[PDB]
Each structure stands twice: as C-alpha cells, then as structure tokens.
C-alpha cells in the first residue's frame, strides 16, 4: 500500500510489509510504491543523447542525461560520450588483449555481468552475424564455444536456474516451465504468483553463494515490464555506487529472441529485428562500461538458456488416438509429455497399461513413452517427486497433446505459433550460446562445446567464491580462463585391492557349473603364469586401474586378454578392462564351449556366483564382461568363461550385448585404430544417478545373493590422432561411452523384431553417456594414470558423444 520511492529507485534490499517496494521485482508482485513509475521508470526524451542535448542543464524528469554532471552522477545515456565528447562506440574499437584487470580505484575484484538471452539458438552466431556486430566482437575477441548444451527439458526456467546453481533440474527442483508437486498439492506456472514461493527453488544459486561469502549480489530475476534500456541504465547506476554498497555480480535478462521465435519459427524473416535489438542492447552496455572506464575491468558472460525449433499445431500427436480412457489422465503437454492419474490416490489406474497403449502403435509415431527410471541416464531426469512416473520423449519438430480440443481453440482452430523448445538436450536446434569476455577469460580463444551445469563453478572462480556442492566437474572448464583460482586434484582411493593367487582346488567348488575344458608342454607354461600375474596388463589397462572411492572388498584379476576389479560383495566385476587393436580377429564361441562356465581358483566358492541359480531363474540368463569372441587365442578363450567374468543378463538384453561385443567393438577398433574398453554393471534402483549400496538392491538372481544390475556401461577410449594406435598414443584421447538399461524386453526399440544390425546401435546411441555419469553411478574414478594434465582429463570425462550431425 503506502510510502514513497524517493531516493530508493531500484533499491538492492527488498523490504517487507506493510512498507511498499522500489526494487526491480516490485512490479511482478504488484507492490511498488504509488510513485514508482513517476520516479523510477522515467522515459522522457528516450534513451539517446543527441547533439542539441550536449551540455544541457540537468532536468531530473529525463530518462537519462546529457548534462555535464552526468558521469559523476552515473546516469548519462549510454551514447553520451560518443555524441557529446568525440568518443568512439565500443564496437568500433579494435580488439585489444586484456592481460590484466584495468579497474578504477576502490574496485576489489573484476565485477561479473551475466547477459542472458532466452531462446538464442547456437546457430544464430553464424546465421545472424551480419546484424550482430557487438555480439560478434565479444565472440571473436573473447572466449567462445561453438555451442553450449542446455539441460533437459530444454525449457526456460529449468535452464536459467541450472545456470544459477550448477544443478540438474531434478536436484534444484525446477523440473519444467510448469509442474505439479503432489506434496504441496500445487502447480507452478510461468505466469502467476505460485512461482514466487521459495518452496519450489532448491540448491544454492550464485547470488546466495556470493552473499554468504561477503560478495554483494542481488537475484538475477527481472519484471517483464521494465524495458531493456532501463535494465541497462540500472546496472550502470549500480556500478557507480560507493565501494561498500556496490554489487560485484550483475545479471541482465532478455525475453528475446525467444518471444519472437515462438511466433515466427527460429529463422522466420521476422527474426532479424529481434537479433538487431539484442545487439543494440549489448552495445548500450559496452558503451556504458567504456564511459565508466569499466570495459577492460568487468567479466561479461553472454549465455542463452536453450535454442528453438520449427513446431506447428498440425505436427501434434494426440493421446486420444491411442487411449480409450483419455479422461483418466492428466498430461503436461508440448515438446515433452508427463502423465499422471487425473484422480489423486486412485487404485484402478495402471501405468503399465498406459505405457503399453502408447508403445509402437503407429509406424511413424512421433513420441516414445518411458517410465522415468528408464529414460536415458544422460538426461538425469527422474529423482524428483515433481517428475511424473510416465514420460514421453517427443520427436524434434513435434508436440504431444491429450485431445484435439486442447490445441484447436474456438471458433475453429488457427495456429499462430511456429517455434518451440523443450526437446532432448542433444538435439541440434536446442543448443545455445556461450561467450566470455574480460580480463579473466582468454583472448581470441575457441573452446569445445560443454554443458551449462559447468558454468556455476566458473562463475564462482570469477568471483573468488567457493562453489556450493553441485553437478559441475570443477576444473573441467579451467581452459576457458586466463587465470585459474581452482587447482583440481584426483579423489583419494578409499579401498585398496587384493591381488589373490591360486588358493582353491577345483573340488572345493560346488557351483553347478560345467565346462568341456580338460582339452590338452613347458614353453607356454611360464607364459600362462606370467599373464595371470599381470604381464600383458600394460596392454589392457592403458590409463591405470580405476580408483575405488568407497569402502568395499575387491580383487584384481589378471588374464592374457583382460584385467578386472572383482567385487566380493557384489559377486561380479565392478570393471573389466581390455584393449582390441585394429588388427584383432573376431572368433566364435566353439560348439563344445557354448554353456561352459569355469570356477576361478583365485576366488573362494563363497565369493563366487553359481550356475544353479541361473538354471533355476527362468527369467534371468548370463553374459560375460570380456567377450569370448575377442579372445587372442583358442587357449586364452578359456579365461573368458571364468565365473568371475559372468554377469546376470535378461535374454532380451543378451541380444543387445552380444551384438555390441561380437560386431560393434571390432568395428570401433577398425574405425578408431584400436580401442580400449572398460565395461561393468551399474546398480541404481532408486534412480538418483548415484551408486547403490548393497542394501538398496531390489532384485537378485532367484534364490541367490547375486544382485541384478539396472544398467551396463562401457567406456571406449582411443587416440584422438587416429594415426596412432590406441595402445601407443602420445597425445590427447578420444572417448565415447554408454549406459544401457538392463531391461527384460526390447519394447523401447520398435524395430527389435528385425536383425540387431537394424536397431542395436541406434539404442546405444540414444544411451550415450559422459565418463563422469558412469563415475557417479559406480563410485569409480577413471584415467588415473595418463601423460595428460588433470584439467584436460576432467574435460574428457565431461565429453558426451551426441551423434547429431552439424
Ligand atoms: C548433483 O549435485 C547435488 C548437490 O551436490 C547432489 O545432490 C545431493 O545429494 C546428496 C546425497 O543424496 C544429498 O545429501 C542428503 O542430504 C540430506 C539433507 O537434505 C536437505 O539439506 C540439503 C543441504 O542444505 C543446505 O545446503 C545448501 C547448499 O548446497 C543450502 O542452499 C541449503 O539452504 C542448506 O543450508 C539440501 O540441499 C536438500 O535439498 C533437497 O531437498 C530440498 C527441500 O525439499 C529441495 O528444495 C532441493 O531441491 C533438494 O531436493 C533434491 O534432493 C533431495 C534429497 O536431499 C531429493 O529427495 C529431491 O528429489 C531433489 O532431488 C535438503 O533440504 C540428508 O538428510 C541426507 O542424509 C540421509 O541419507 C544418507 C544416505 O543417503 C545418510 O547417510 C544420512 O544419515 C541420512 O539418512 C538418515 O535420515 C533419513 C531420515 O531423515 C533416513 O533416510 C535414514 O533412515 C537415516 O535415518 C543426505 O546427506 C543432498 O541433499 C543433495 N543436494 C541437492 C541440492 O540435491 C546430486 O546427487 C548430484 N547428482 C548427481 C547425479 O551426481
Ligand atoms: C528463488 C528466488 O529467489 N525467488 C523465487 C522467484 C521470485 C520471482 C519474483 C518475481 C519474478 N518476476 C519475473 N520473473 C521472470 C524472470 O525474471 N525471468 C523470465 C528471467 C529469469 C532470470 C533469472 C532466473 C534464474 N535463476 C530465472 Cl529462472 C528467470 C520471475 O521469474 C520472478 C521470480 C523471486 C524470489
Ligand atoms: Ca542409486
Ligand atoms: Cl514443462
Ligand atoms: K535362467
Ligand atoms: Na521392440
Ligand atoms: Zn520459449
């Protein structure tokens, strides 16, 4: 209600009731003092000095000032010095390297300004280059990536809050632009008051991190009605505050180009103007900085939240074409789908029937249903009660809706949107931008594409802050920075391995296993012992053994063709490592060995699996981590049938695994000049993306203590310079990895009735993963011994092979 904004315009500390507000959010709350527009939103004479205004007598009613006292007051129009003092616009100056911060007296650290653009698709940097000269200058003189990968869903609020926290949406809680929380019994929407409640927003955003550590920073939010010119003058005025009152971190947000993109499509003729306007805004800021002598002092980040795809009303799939009982569901619609029961706590609603009704029903169906725990692990989109159990991943360019009436509104439905976003974060059109410019960033430097979850750590480094715990890998972006404040180091190994020798006689085992192995000297007898003691180990373990980062009991087991870390707790390897050269031969499993499983005399009966359990369990079969198909000799092949190389596999999954092992590994070795492979099980029954403890396991091989993995991983490494073979590589490494769901059916692959060569590799691609994802899921740390710097290895562990084109 009552009070005035006199002397309080855009105040940094927000005031509580009954008092009214004057901060950059009061409009959104409808709580500004009655004089806020008059005092704080002045517009008279616009935003630019003209020659007749130079030296004018100050008139306090003006939007900005061209009077002689304006620099000292901090409120000149941004082009004042250009029009009134002969100066050049920032964009017209040559790029000059900023070797050290050049800041006015009283500046304790380089401020950080974050310039966020909604819907700014990565390819705008090239395609709109002719109309964005300020942005193209930032980009070419500063540090830039060809693109930056958003988080899933590629929506506005999940991505902006990820930028601010370094957390996946499942952890920070802003899991969509709209969501329903079943505990609150309440819905969050872009428009409305509910989103104002702090209960939705978890983690610790940069502004709170800054404030707790004595670095001044307000929120990054802005009321929509404040025009962009007024946001810029406001940041410039804040920058003129006394040392003790002045923030060190600033955020500008633009609703464009996303606003126009939705109307016109990502490349509509109408899009050129919104890009011109954003560029002009960047020039205002840079001109303003140059006037305050801050242009070689501040670090500027030009970053988007997501891209934009062509999407029209007629490319909509309707759930009413698949379900008969469509009135029993609630759907969060659009470029993703989330389905829950219409009536809360209803007993006769069956997720399984709904999934079945939505699976592979039309040949060219433009969505695929998933239980959230089965979504690709790279999306990290499950561990939150606001994420509905049923999820539809929608094809790029499409929508999903519940019924035709939701889309085609009355009289009779015309469209009027041509662009949208929210799809899978690997989709090219969803990629967005990153540019860093300033003393702390590198000069004229390209960096590879990286994920937006990494930026929070870098922003904290830019500000001298210790980051709160987050999902970035701190050190993975050190290569963006001229001067690093963070020196990453490897985690300490927690469990050391046992190295067992031959300890058990064959007749001590009663595993119900058989093998035809008595088949067949003194020459290849010391050679056998040498191999078991680790002689080929430098060939098959190329980057050191993985470190185990939790308390457990495990054995290193050496063999001619592979090495493994065998867990006595889980009764199977945590990891199995082997190298396949370009020249390696694929062989079959000989007939007499089809069902061969051999006791491992290094490992006690009590810490072994047993064949009887597999015989008894009519759902569950087994496979091998090191593939028998890739044995170096008929004799070495016997090692691949050890009980200690066996893992539980559904027959449906064995189709996938066997194709990977028999066909794909050798293909990758041919294409990449050898590969090193590390494979193993993953257990994540509570879908939190983290290694399960043994008391979290919900499924065992019938009547045994053999736990069933939820997923199987492989990491496939070779030499970046493929003229060098994987095992003799002098330089940087190249990696691709996957985490395959261990599922009892192949319903996810609509083509699975066909030959494996038509569907397996597509499935694997969909489930591509970062090394770092596998680390969280296993409590292992890889690449412990290489000739590469740790920062570079941290970048490699964050890499995701996406299989998109260009
Ligand atoms: C990505 O990175 C993130 C961050 O590093 C990783 O997420 C972290 O994962 C940790 C391990 O799972 C988890 O540890 C929990 O923490 C429990 C305490 O939870 C609350 O407090 C957290 C800390 O708050 C303070 O610090 C932050 C700075 O970061 C400040 O900003 C805060 O203001 C505080 O000062 C807090 O972050 C956490 O937030 C969640 O819940 C909020 C409130 O509802 C949400 O608003 C918010 O969005 C968060 O929601 C996410 O996380 C929760 C789980 O925490 C999840 O359910 C949601 O779906 C969502 O994803 C809370 O407010 C602590 O109690 C836990 O300890 C119990 O379990 C362990 C074993 O698991 C035991 O060792 C322990 O003894 C204890 O068990 C006992 O007690 C239980 C009964 O109470 C019972 O189960 C049992 O029987 C025992 O008796 C454990 O430490 C972190 O909370 C979590 N942080 C975040 C932000 O998510 C994430 O894993 C990374 N992802 C990947 C893939 O790597
Ligand atoms: C958590 C907290 O402090 N709260 C809870 C939310 C609250 C609140 C109050 C008023 C608001 N007025 C406008 N908008 C729209 C807007 O600012 N954007 C579109 C730009 C933007 C900029 C940075 C981030 C980020 N990160 C994000 Cl998600 C969005 C808001 O979202 C908004 C939120 C403030 C206090
Ligand atoms: Ca888990
Ligand atoms: Cl959403
Ligand atoms: K079986
Ligand atoms: Na199928
Ligand atoms: Zn949008």
Short mmCIF file of C-alpha atoms and ligand atoms in Angstrom, two decimals, residues 25 28-29 157 160-161 164 195-196 198 201 207 219-223 253, ligand 2:
data_model
loop_
_atom_site.label_atom_id
_atom_site.label_comp_id
_atom_site.label_asym_id
_atom_site.label_seq_id
_atom_site.Cartn_x
_atom_site.Cartn_y
_atom_site.Cartn_z
CA UNK A 25 10.81 -7.01 -8.88
CA UNK A 28 5.79 -8.60 -10.54
CA UNK A 29 4.39 -8.57 -7.02
CA UNK A 157 13.07 -21.80 -16.04
CA UNK A 160 18.12 -20.46 -16.12
CA UNK A 161 18.01 -21.88 -12.62
CA UNK A 164 22.49 -20.09 -11.40
CA UNK A 195 6.31 -19.43 -8.63
CA UNK A 196 7.14 -16.63 -6.15
CA UNK A 198 10.66 -20.09 -2.29
CA UNK A 201 13.52 -23.43 -5.59
CA UNK A 207 23.58 -14.79 -5.63
CA UNK A 219 18.79 -12.01 -7.63
CA UNK A 220 19.02 -12.36 -11.38
CA UNK A 221 15.19 -12.02 -11.89
CA UNK A 222 13.56 -9.04 -13.74
CA UNK A 223 9.93 -7.79 -14.03
CA UNK A 253 17.91 -10.94 -18.90
C1 LIG B 2 14.31 -18.24 -5.84
C2 LIG B 2 14.01 -16.80 -5.51
O1 LIG B 2 14.92 -16.05 -5.11
N1 LIG B 2 12.69 -16.31 -5.65
C3 LIG B 2 11.53 -17.11 -6.18
C4 LIG B 2 11.06 -16.47 -7.51
C5 LIG B 2 10.73 -14.95 -7.30
C6 LIG B 2 10.27 -14.23 -8.53
C7 LIG B 2 9.65 -12.96 -8.31
C8 LIG B 2 9.34 -12.13 -9.37
C9 LIG B 2 9.64 -12.55 -10.72
N2 LIG B 2 9.39 -11.64 -11.81
C10 LIG B 2 9.70 -12.02 -13.02
N3 LIG B 2 10.22 -13.30 -13.34
C11 LIG B 2 10.53 -13.55 -14.75
C12 LIG B 2 12.09 -13.56 -14.87
O2 LIG B 2 12.80 -12.94 -14.07
N4 LIG B 2 12.69 -14.28 -15.87
C13 LIG B 2 11.94 -14.81 -17.05
C14 LIG B 2 14.11 -14.12 -16.02
C15 LIG B 2 14.85 -15.04 -15.08
C16 LIG B 2 16.11 -14.61 -14.64
C17 LIG B 2 16.89 -15.46 -13.84
C18 LIG B 2 16.38 -16.75 -13.46
C19 LIG B 2 17.20 -17.59 -12.65
N5 LIG B 2 17.87 -18.28 -11.97
C20 LIG B 2 15.09 -17.16 -13.90
CL1 LIG B 2 14.51 -18.74 -13.50
C21 LIG B 2 14.31 -16.31 -14.71
C22 LIG B 2 10.49 -14.26 -12.34
O3 LIG B 2 10.87 -15.39 -12.69
C23 LIG B 2 10.21 -13.85 -10.94
C24 LIG B 2 10.52 -14.68 -9.84
C25 LIG B 2 11.97 -14.17 -6.72
C26 LIG B 2 12.41 -14.84 -5.41
#
